[PDB]
Amino acid sequence: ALLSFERKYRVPGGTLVGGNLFDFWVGPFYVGFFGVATFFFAALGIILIAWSAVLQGTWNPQLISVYPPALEYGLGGAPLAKGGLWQIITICATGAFVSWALREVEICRKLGIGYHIPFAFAFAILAYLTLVLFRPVMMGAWGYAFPYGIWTHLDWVSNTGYTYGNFHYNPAHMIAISFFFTNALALALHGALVLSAANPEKGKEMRTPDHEDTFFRDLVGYSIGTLGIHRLGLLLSLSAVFFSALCMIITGTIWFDQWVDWWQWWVKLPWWANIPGGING
């Protein structure tokens, strides 16, 4: 199936060196060179919810668990359901993260829409990596990792997330939250910055980008335009992750101690050194 204007856009290529051997449009979906790759990755991956459903216990993805290896086995493998079989799921996950963000280029080079999209999933490629590769290779073994589940890695983040006291004292974490609540801060007015002009209240003539400049300059004193808030969505939604992968690339591997004990490096200053002031005083 294809759209009405999807007539002129149909042209073979996009893929690199080898030919148009893999680029057949199966339905509404694109099966380029990384299309059948993800077909190979998505077919094996549904079984990885069902494998440790006979080794760890339950058959329902409520408590299904293929645990990460232990902490100290070294630079190597593991048991199985408790690491070994866990060690196989990732290169599919990530091998499928990759075969997706780069099958887009077989459409990007196919037409001529920009290459800033093999990229906004690469802050998701550099956000799931920081929990599977970036951490547990150095402190001992692959045992420093989370479980894949949907209720297993839940009681892994809270009642097992106060190893560093409270994680709010974690400054970049809290800056990578000074970056996150600001994502829907600028989707809430921009997802409503194109809605109510052809549908004003009912009947009225449509607005142009000069009413935008009498509504938002009549809002919050800053009107960078309409191309300043798509440079104000891709500024809300990619970086709360490098300020979290930096809230953790120096947390646990260097600071497996209380980050509530980090906020006593601030009160130590020669000026007010030997001085208890307020609350502290």
Ligand X SMILES: CC[C@H]1c2cc3[nH]c4c(c3C)C(=O)[C@H](C(=O)OC)c4c3nc(cc4[nH]c(cc(n2)[C@@H]1C)c(C(C)=O)c4C)[C@@H](C)[C@@H]3CCC(=O)OC/C=C(\C)CCC[C@H](C)CCC[C@H](C)CCCC(C)C
Which residues belong to the annotated binding site? 153, 173, 190, 216, 230
DSSP 261: G
Closest to 147 (Cα-Cα) out of 155, 139, 137: 155
87 binds another protein (CB under 8 A): yes
Q: How far is the CB of 256 from another protein (least distance, A)?
A: 19
DSSP string, 42-100: HHHHGGGGTSTTTTTS-SSTTT-------SSS-SS---STTTTTHHHHHHHHHHHHHHH
Contact (CB, 8 A) for 225 and 172: no
Token look-up 């300059």 returns: 217
Burial class (CB in 10 A: 0-12, 13-18, 19+), 15: buried
Q: How far is the CB of 202 from another protein (least distance, A)?
A: 5
Q: Which of 70, 80, 93, 249 binds ligand X (CB under 6 A)?
A: 93
Q: Which of 72, 116, 265, 274 binds another protein (CB under 8 A)?
A: 116
Distance CA 21, CA 12 (A): 10
Q: Which of 130, 182, 237, 239 binds ligand BCL (CB under 6 A)?
A: 130
Q: Which of 70, 93, 102, 107 binds another protein (CB under 8 A)?
A: 107
| Residues in 188-217 at the binding interface with ligand X, rule: CB under 6 A | 188-189
127 binds ligand BCL (CB under 6 A): yes
Q: How many CB atoms lie within 10 A of CB 79?
A: 15
134 binds another protein (CB under 8 A): no
Binding partner selected for residue 134 from another protein, Fe ion, ligand BCL, none, CB under the kind-specific 5 to 8 Å limit: none
Q: Which residues bind ligand X (CB under 6 A)?
A: 38, 41-42, 45, 48, 89, 92-93, 96-97, 100, 120-121, 123-124, 127, 148, 150, 181, 184-185, 188-189, 219-220, 237-238, 241
